[PDB]
Amino acid sequence: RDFGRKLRLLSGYLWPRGSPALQLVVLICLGLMGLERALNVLVPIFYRNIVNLLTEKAPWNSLAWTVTSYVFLKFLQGGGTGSTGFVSNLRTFLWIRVQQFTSRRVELLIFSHLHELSLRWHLGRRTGEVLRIADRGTSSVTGLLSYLVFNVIPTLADIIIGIIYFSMFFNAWFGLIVFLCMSLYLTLTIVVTEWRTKFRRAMNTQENATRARAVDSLLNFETVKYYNAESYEVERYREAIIKYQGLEWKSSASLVLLNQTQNLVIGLGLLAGSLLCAYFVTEQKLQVGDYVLFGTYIIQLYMPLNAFGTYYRMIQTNFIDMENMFDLLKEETEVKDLPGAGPLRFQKGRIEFENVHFSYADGRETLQDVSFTVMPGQTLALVGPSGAGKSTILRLLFRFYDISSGCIRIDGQDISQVTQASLRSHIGVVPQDTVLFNDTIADNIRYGRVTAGNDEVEAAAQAAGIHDAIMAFPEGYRTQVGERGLKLSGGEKQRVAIARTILKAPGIILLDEATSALDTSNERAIQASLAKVCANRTTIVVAHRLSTVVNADQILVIKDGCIVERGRHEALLSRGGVYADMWQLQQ
Amino acid sequence: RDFGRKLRLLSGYLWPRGSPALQLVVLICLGLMGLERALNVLVPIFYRNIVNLLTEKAPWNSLAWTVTSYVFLKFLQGGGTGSTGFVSNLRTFLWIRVQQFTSRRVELLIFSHLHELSLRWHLGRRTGEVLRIADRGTSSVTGLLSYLVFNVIPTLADIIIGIIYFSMFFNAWFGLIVFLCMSLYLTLTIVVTEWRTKFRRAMNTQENATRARAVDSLLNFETVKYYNAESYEVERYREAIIKYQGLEWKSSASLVLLNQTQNLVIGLGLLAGSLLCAYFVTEQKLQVGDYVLFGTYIIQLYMPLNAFGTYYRMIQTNFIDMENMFDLLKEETEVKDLPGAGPLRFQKGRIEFENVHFSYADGRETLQDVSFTVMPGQTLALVGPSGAGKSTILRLLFRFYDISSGCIRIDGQDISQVTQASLRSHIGVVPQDTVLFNDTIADNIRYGRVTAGNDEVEAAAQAAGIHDAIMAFPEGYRTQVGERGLKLSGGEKQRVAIARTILKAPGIILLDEATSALDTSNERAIQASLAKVCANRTTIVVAHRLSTVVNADQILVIKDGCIVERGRHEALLSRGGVYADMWQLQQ
Ligand SMILES: Nc1ncnc2c1ncn2[C@@H]1O[C@H](COP(=O)(O)OP(=O)(O)O)[C@@H](O)[C@H]1O
Ligand SMILES: Nc1ncnc2c1ncn2[C@@H]1O[C@H](COP(=O)(O)OP(=O)(O)O)[C@@H](O)[C@H]1O
Ligand code: VO4
Ligand code: VO4
Ligand SMILES: [Mg+2]
Ligand SMILES: [Mg+2]
C-alpha cells in the first residue's frame, strides 16, 4: 500500500547518509542518552554509602575521597528536575549539528523541484499556498527526527528488556501473555484514533486558503488603493479567520477528550484488581497483607502503557500534518524529454511548421492548420486582432506546451526528439510583459551570460539606446530597480529587457510586442541598431503599430486560429484584403 | 525609557480588554493551577492516614469508602509528572479560548496597518521581509502570554510566601538579608546575558534576506526559465543558507555555555557548604549531624533560584523577536491629513495647476513650472518622449505624493485641506500596468461598486467591448484568470480594467494608456463608445500612439520636466514645431 512507498523514501533523509562524520554523531548521542538513566539511578547508592561512612566516624582521608567522588558524580548527573547538567547538555550541543543537515536537505530539495514543473502548473498556482507548504513541511521532518531518537527508542528498548526479563522469574509461558496483552492494547487504541484524522485534515485544507487572501491581496497594492478599499479587505480577512478559529476549536478539544477516556479505562481496570484485593482482605476469606506486590504492580504497567499511548498520538499528528507536502513532490512534469537523445545540431537556422493543431482545454480549437516556412537571414512578422492567437505560435516554438499533431522542425530535425535543455541555448526572446529581479541594474542586465565582463555589458546596452539616459541618473548603475521592477519607469523597463537578449547574442530572436510602450522616436534607432547587430538573423516579431514592420521580408495575418492571407508589403497592399483595411484605418 | 512606552502596548493586548466574558477565563485557569498544586501536596497525607487506619484490623465499610475517595482523589491528582489528570487538562482546554483572542487581535492589527503606509514605502519593500516579520511577531506574543500565567506568577507568589513565612520562625531582619542576596544574584545574571543579545540580531536579520531569495525568485518564473537556470538559482540559494546555518551555530551554543556556567557557581557553593558542614561535624564542637537540616535549607536557596534564572532567558529571546517586529509599527504615513478637514464639494470638476515644482530624492528637478488649466467638458492630451514625466504628472493629481511649491485646485479649492479619503472617491483611474485578483472575472470587474448587482455589471462591460468574446469562452463569467492575471490574454487584461472604471462611473477620468495593447480596430470602437457615456465628465489621456488623440480638445508636449508648446491639433501642426517632427516621422 501507499504507506510503504512513503516510508521507504523517508528512509534516506531521516538517517544521515553519505557523510560518515555525521553518521557517527547519532550513535554517541544515543549512548549518552542511555548512560543518563543509569547514572541517575546509581547516584543514590553512593549517597547511602557516604551515610554509613559517616556513621562509623572514619578518618578524614577516606570520607574526603568519598565526598569528592560523590560531588563529581552529582555534577555529572545534573540533578533530576530540569536535567540542567553536563551529560544532559552535551547531548543538545552535539545534536545541533545533525539536525541542521536534515533541515538543509529537505528544504533545498523541494525548491529544486518547484523550478521544474511545466508552466501550466505555475500559472494555476496561488502563491500563498505554495509558500506556506514548505514552511509547515520542513518543520514536520525536523520535528519527527529530533523526536524519534530521544524518546521512542529508549522506551521501546526498556520495555522489551522488561518483558525479556522476569520471564525466568515467573513461569516459562508468562512472556506470551504479556506480549499478547501489549499487542491487544495497541490494536485497540488504533481504531479509536480515527476520530481525529478528519478534523485535522479539515483544519489543514482550510488553512491554506486563508493564507491566499493575504499574500494575494498585499501583492497588488496599487489596485487596492486606486479604487476605495481598506475597509472591504480588512473585513474579508477577518471573516476568513473566524472559520479557521471554529474549525480549530473542534480539533484541539477532541484531543483532550480522547486523552481522558484513555486514562479512565486504565484507572478502573486497575481499580478492579484493587477491589479484588480488598475483597480478599478484611477476613472475608483471608487477612493477607499482600499489598506490597500489588502496589508495585500498578506502576509497572501504568507508566509504560500510558506513555506508549501518549506518544503514538504525536506521531500520527505529525504524519497527518506532513501529508500535504507529498503531493507537491509527486506531481510529475508534463513536457518530457524522450529518454535518450542529444544536442540539436545547429546551422544558420531554418524553422518550419507543418499541420500543427493545439488546444488548451479541448473545448475549442485554438489553432487549426498552420503552415509557414522561413529562410535564414530573413524577417517574418505576424499581425492580428487581439486574442486571435499571435502569442501561442511564438510560445510553442520555445517548447513550453506540447504539440498535438503535425510537427515543428528546426534545421531539418524535429524538436520532440532533441533534449529540451539544449533547445533553450540558441533561442532568445523578449517577453510581452517584463519582470525584473529586485536588484541593481548592473546585476540585472548581465544576467544572460554570467561570465561576461564589465566592459561588454556596457557595450551591449549602448547599442540598445538606453545607456545615454542611465548615466544621467544619480548614483549611476548602483541604482535599485525595486520590487517587480516598476519603480524604474514606465517604458525604460522595456529597453532594459531588450538589452538583456542582445547581451546573450542567441541564434534566433523572438521579439513580442516589444517595440510598443516606447515612443515613436526612439523606436527607429532601436530597430536600426538591432538590425546591424541582429544576432544570427532569423527573427519573428509580433507588433501592432504597422509603422514598424513595413519593410519586413514576409508578413502574415491571423484572424482566428488560421492563416488568412500572406505576402510582402506592397504586393499584398494592392490585393485589397483585410490588411488593406487595417492600413487605411491606421491612416 | 522606550521600554516604558513599549510595555503599554503590551499591556493593551495581553490581558483581555473590554470583553468581560473572556475577561473571566484567566482567573479560573489560574485558580485551577493553584488547586492542582494543593491536591498534589495534599494526597500523600491522606494516603498515609488511610494506610495506618486500614493496617490494624476491623473495617466496617469505612475501608471501602476511604478507598473509593482515595481513587477519585488520585484521579483528580493527575499523577504528577504526566499532568494527565482531570484538573490539568481542564486548564489547557479552557486556555484555548483566550489565547486565540490575543492571536487574532495582533495579526489583524498589523494587516490593517500595512495598507495605510504611502506608496513609496511599498515600492521599496522586499516581499520576503514583510511577509516573514509578521509571522515571527504573531508567535512571540502568544508565546510570552503563556509564561506570565502558567510559570512565572506561581514561582513569584511562592517566593513571596516563603519570605513572609519564616519571618516569625527566625529573626525579622533575616528577610532583608535574603532579599538583598537574591537581588545581588539577579544583578549578575543580567550582565552575563546582555553580552549574548548583540549576537542574535545578526541571526535574525540574516534570515530575512535568505527569505528574500525564495519568494522573489519564485515570483517571476518567466525570467528564470527564458534563460537557463536551476544551475545558478539553486546554487545561489544554498549560499544564503550556509551563512545563516553557521550563524545559528555560533548563537545556540552560547546558550549552553551560559546555562552550564551559571550552574557551576551553585555547585561550588554547595561544595563549600558541605565542606564547612563536614568540618563542623568532625568533632569541632560536636558530632552533631546538622547536615540533615542544612541540606533542606540549601535546597531552598537552590531550586527557587535556579528556576528563577532559567526563566529569564526565554523572556529575553521573546523581546528580541518582538524588537525586530515593532519597527514596522512605528513608521508613519509619508502624507497625512491636516487635522480637522471637511469633505470636498464637487460641482463640475474643473482642475487648475499653478507653478508646481516636484522631485523624488533632491538629486534633480523632475517637474519645472508646469502650468495648465482645463475647463469642464474637454479633453487634455499629453504627448512626449519617454521619461519626460507624464506619468508623474498624472500620479500627482491623485495625491499619492505631495507637492513642494505652489498648489493645485479642484473646483476652485485646494487639495491640501481636504482629507484624502474623500478625494479618491470622485476620481477614476485605469493604471499603466494592470493587475488582477486571483478570482473569476465576475469578481474583478465588479470590484468597483460592491453594492452593484449582476444586471448593471453585464450592461456595463458592453460599452467596453469585451462582452462578445467572453461568452465564446467555456464556462462564461466563471472562468479563472489565475495568479496575477497573466493567464487571461495579452490584450483583454487591459480591457477588463477599462470596464472596471466604467462600472464605477466617476466624475472625472484619467486613462493613463489605454491603447497600448488593444489592436487598431477594437480601438476605434472603444473610443466611440467611451464618448457616448457623457460629454460632461472631464478626462486626461496620455497616449504614445498619436492617432488616438488627433481630435482631442487641447494638447501638451513635455520635453523634460517643462512644457514646450501648446495648441490644438489643426492649428499647431502648421507651426512646424517639434510636434510637427513627431507626427511627420510617425506617418
Ligand atoms: N493559459 C491559458 N488559459 C486559458 N486560455 C488561454 C491560455 N492561453 C491562451 N488562451 C486563449 O488563447 C488566446 C491567446 O491569444 P494570444 O495570442 O495570447 O493573443 P494576443 O496576441 O492578443 O496576446 C487568448 O484569447 C486566450 O483566450
Ligand atoms: N518611484 C520613483 N523613484 C525614483 N525615480 C523615479 C520614480 N518614478 C519615476 N522616476 C524617474 O522619474 C521619471 C518618471 O518618468 P515617467 O513619467 O515614468 O516616464 P514615462 O511616462 O515615459 O514612463 C523616470 O525617468 C524615472 O527615472
Ligand atoms: O509611461 V511611457 O515610458 O510609455 O511615456
Ligand atoms: O494583446 V497582443 O495581440 O499586443 O499580444
Ligand atoms: Mg509612465
Ligand atoms: Mg500576447
Residue numbers in the entry:
A (entry chain A), B (entry chain B): 240 to 826
Anything the authors wrote about it?
Human ATP-binding cassette transporter subfamily B6 (ABCB6) is a mitochondrial porphyrin transporter that uses energy from ATP hydrolysis to translocate the heme precursors protoporphyrin IX and coproporphyrinogen III from the cytoplasm into mitochondria for heme biosynthesis. ABCB6 is a Type IV half-transporter of 842 amino acids with only one transmembrane domain (TMD) and one cytosolic nucleotide-binding domain (NBD) with an extra N-terminal TMD (TMD0). It functions as a homodimer with the substrate transport pathway and the active site of ATP hydrolysis built from residues from both chains. Within the transport pathway, a conserved aromatic residue W546 located in each monomer plays a pivotal role in stabilizing the occluded conformation via π-stacking interactions.
To evaluate the structural impact of W546A mutation, we prepared grids using detergent-purified or nanodisc-reconstituted W546A mutant. As expected, the first 3D classification analysis revealed that most of the detergent-purified mutant molecules (59.5%) adopted an outward-facing conformation. The final EM density map of the detergent-purified W546A mutant in the outward-facing state was obtained from the best 3D class containing 56,293 particles at a resolution of 3.9 Å with C1 or C2 symmetry, which enabled us to build an almost complete model of the transporter. The structure has the typical features expected for the outward-facing conformation of an ABC transporter. The TMDs form a V-shaped translocation pathway that is both open to the extracellular space and laterally to the membrane outer leaflet. There was no density corresponding to CPIII, suggesting that the bound substrate is exported from the transporter prior to ATP hydrolysis and ADP/Pi release. However, the structure has relatively poor electron density and high B-factors for the extracellular side of TMDs, suggesting that these regions undergo highly dynamic motions to promote substrate release. In the NBD dimer, the two Mg2+/ADP·VO4 molecules are sandwiched at the interface, interacting with the Walker A and B motifs, the A- and Q-loop residues of one NBD, and the ABC signature motif (LSGGE) of the opposing NBD. However, adoption of the outward-facing conformation exposes negatively-charged residues E346, D374, E446, and E487 at the bottom of the cavity. This negatively-charged surface appears to promote substrate release into the extracellular space by pushing porphyrins along the translocation pathway via charge repulsion, while simultaneously preventing exported substrates from re-entering the cavity. Conversely, adoption of an outward-facing conformation shifts the side chains of key residues away from the substrate-binding site (lower right).
